Amino acid sequence: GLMQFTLPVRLCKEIELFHFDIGPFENMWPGIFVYMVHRSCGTSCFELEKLCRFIMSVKKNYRRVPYHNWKHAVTVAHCMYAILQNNHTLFTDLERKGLLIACLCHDLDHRGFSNSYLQKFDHPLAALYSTSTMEQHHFSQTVSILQLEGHNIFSTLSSSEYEQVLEIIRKAIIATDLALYFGNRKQLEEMYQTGSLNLNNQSHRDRVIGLMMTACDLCSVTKLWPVTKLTANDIYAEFWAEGDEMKKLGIQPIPMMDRDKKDEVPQGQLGFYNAVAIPCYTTLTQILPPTEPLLKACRDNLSQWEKVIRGE
Ligand SMILES: Cc1ncc(C)n2nc(CCc3nc(-c4ccccc4)cn3C)nc12
Ligand SMILES: [Mg+2]
Ligand SMILES: [Zn+2]
């Protein structure tokens, strides 16, 4: 079915847009990713059946949580596609392969719990992964699927390029740890404001990719207001489910994960846009000017959250 899939011509036009919402096309998501892969990395990069067998196993290894699910994975892949498409030249063929795959796998087997939870309540995953707990497990899950029968989409690569792509994927997936973003953005802004940013520099390159992975991970805030508001509901549903477990252990969770504090969501978003989102897309537009619509869309939703606080 997925091998014999064809995208409607109307989707082909609108998929290129940054603000495009995949929500309405649930059954077309696997085939949408294939489409984006072929448009970005050509039709020959992966063996069709290997890619399709890989994709459907990635889907199966996302749980049915409120936010960090198959929908989110594909939404994050699309935003990268849009970034890559508008900045195709800056990145290598192998970087475009890995980054799209990485976005699709970046929350693989996500349990609906934060890194703080797993570490604080000694979960097995926190035992073998100290910092960036779930993120390291996501890459570990990505490699596991790659090592299943007929799933190794990179099998035809040279051992050198195989090791290169995995390290781009690894770095990309670890970068989606929002704890590491704040440091990453600070340096990248520093490298821009001084004029010392250079894409020939590998470490600078990895930092730019890291920011792109954050921009993509957060992109629900760059959609049209109704889609942004709806996804926000899915986010807090996951946080509140985690806070309930902390409450069940007597421990009061942080306001963000406390459903009893749902009143302070608009204020909480207002802070998230100011502290995280706006600075994220601001620095990204300065490095990659064609990504500007992401900042515009984020700004619009910022004023919407301001509009919600004022009672309008
Ligand atoms: C849109 C979005 N995309 C991605 C991510 C990771 N997130 N995370 C948030 C939570 C923001 C947030 N809500 C609160 C809060 C809410 C109610 C009561 C008290 C505090 C605080 N903060 C920071 N939203 C997003
Ligand atoms: Mg994640
Ligand atoms: Zn994510």
Swiss-Prot record:
The free-text tissue note of the record is: Abundant in the putamen and caudate nucleus regions of brain and testis, moderately expressed in the thyroid gland, pituitary gland, thalamus and cerebellum.
Tell me the residue numbers annotated for binding 3',5'-cyclic GMP.
Answer: 68, 269
Name the residues that bind 3',5'-cyclic AMP: 68, 269
Residues engaged in binding a divalent metal cation 2: 107
The catalytic site is made up of 68 (proton donor)
Q: Give its localization.
A: Cytoplasm, Cytosol
Q: What is the effect of changing residue 107 to N?
A: Reduces activity 1000-fold
Chain positions recorded as a divalent metal cation 1 binding sites? 72, 106-107, 217
Name all PDEase domain ranges: 1-312
What family is this?
A: Belongs to the cyclic nucleotide phosphodiesterase family.
Q: How does it assemble?
A: Homodimer.
Write down the disease named in this UniProt entry. Dyskinesia, limb and orofacial, infantile-onset: An autosomal recessive, early-onset hyperkinetic movement disorder characterized by axial hypotonia, dyskinesia of the limbs and trunk, orofacial dyskinesia, drooling, and dysarthria. The severity of the hyperkinesis is variable. Striatal degeneration, autosomal dominant 2: An autosomal dominant disorder characterized by striatal degeneration and dysfunction of basal ganglia, resulting in hyperkinesis.
The record's function comment reads:
Plays a role in signal transduction by regulating the intracellular concentration of cyclic nucleotides. Can hydrolyze both cAMP and cGMP, but has higher affinity for cAMP and is more efficient with cAMP as substrate. May play a critical role in regulating cAMP and cGMP levels in the striatum, a region of the brain that contributes to the control of movement and cognition.
Q: What is known of its domains?
A: The tandem GAF domains bind cAMP, and regulate enzyme activity. The binding of cAMP stimulates enzyme activity.
Q: What's the protein called, per UniProt? A: cAMP and cAMP-inhibited cGMP 3',5'-cyclic phosphodiesterase 10A
**What gene name does this entry carry?**
PDE10A
